[PDB]
Amino acid sequence: HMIEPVLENVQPNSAASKAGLQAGDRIVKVDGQPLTQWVTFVMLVRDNPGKSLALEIERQGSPLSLTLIPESKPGNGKAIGFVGIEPKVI
Amino acid sequence: HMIEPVLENVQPNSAASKAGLQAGDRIVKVDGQPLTQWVTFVMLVRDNPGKSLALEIERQGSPLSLTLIPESKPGNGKAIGFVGIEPKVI
């Protein structure tokens, strides 16, 4: 296995904040695809600045659907997504 | 592109600290194996607790050679490498 898609910390507004995402939330689908690694999700975000992603998540074992919209960060090579989530500490 | 192997914050001992790494450092090779993505580096780590890593980095353009020995963290599925680095916020 690798790193499961569970939120460590969410910053304050912060796109992830505004969207309702909490620490401990687990991502289950994005745009109706299941995923199982954090990295899969990260690439998804970075690829969709200001585009809307539809998340099904598990929070306390119960389900939730949240719409999340990456902010747009220069990245200069060239324009990336940003939601403001602290990644689990390696 | 993707995410690059540049270190955001380093932590207080901590195999990464003992090993002598700093925020800003960029990983170039691990056991001669060149890398270009952050995750590539994360994998390498978690997969080698107690094992030891031939490192080549770039600090202010100046190349440099270091050795990392990841601590041995649970994960309990089953025993993972750890160094004490916080990843860029995402």
Swiss-Prot record, chains A, B:
Cystine residue pairs: none
Impact noted for substituting D25K: Cuts RseA without previous DegS cleavage
Upregulation: Part of the sigma-E regulon. Also has a primary sigma-70 factor promoter.
Domain named PDZ: residues: 3-90
Protein localization: Cell inner membrane
Free-text disruption phenotype from the record: Essential. Depletion experiments lead to cessation of growth, elongated cells and limited lysis, as well as decreased amounts of sigma-E. Not essential in an rseA deletion strain, when sigma-E is overexpressed or in ompA-ompC deletion strain. In the latter has severely decreased growth at 20 degrees Celsius. Accumulation of an RseA proteolysis intermediate.
Family (UniProt): Belongs to the peptidase M50B family.
Protein function: A site-2 regulated intramembrane protease (S2P) that cleaves the peptide bond between 'Ala-108' and 'Cys-109' in the transmembrane region of RseA. Part of a regulated intramembrane proteolysis (RIP) cascade. Acts on DegS-cleaved RseA to release the cytoplasmic domain of RseA, residue 'Val-148' of RseA may be required for this. This provides the cell with sigma-E (RpoE) activity through the proteolysis of RseA.
Domain notes: The 2 circularly premutated PDZ domains act to negatively regulate protease action on intact RseA; mutations in PDZ 1 (PDZ-N) have a more deleterious effect than similar mutations in PDZ 2 (PDZ-C). A 31 residue insertion in PDZ-C (between Val-42 and Met-43) domain inhibits protease activity, whereas deletion of residues 203-279 alleviates the PDZ-inhibition, allowing cleavage of intact RseA.
Subunit-level organization: Interacts with RseA; the third transmembrane domain can be cross-linked to the transmembrane domain of RseA.
Something else known: Regulated intramembrane proteolysis (RIP) occurs when an extracytoplasmic signal triggers a concerted proteolytic cascade to transmit information and elicit cellular responses. A membrane-spanning regulatory substrate protein is first cut extracytoplasmically (site-1 protease, S1P), then within the membrane itself (site-2 protease, S2P, this enzyme), while cytoplasmic proteases finish degrading the regulatory protein, liberating the effector protein.
Protein name: Regulator of sigma-E protease RseP
Organism expressing this protein natively: Escherichia coli (strain K12)
Gene assigned in the entry: rseP
Residues of the full protein shown: 222 to 309 of 450
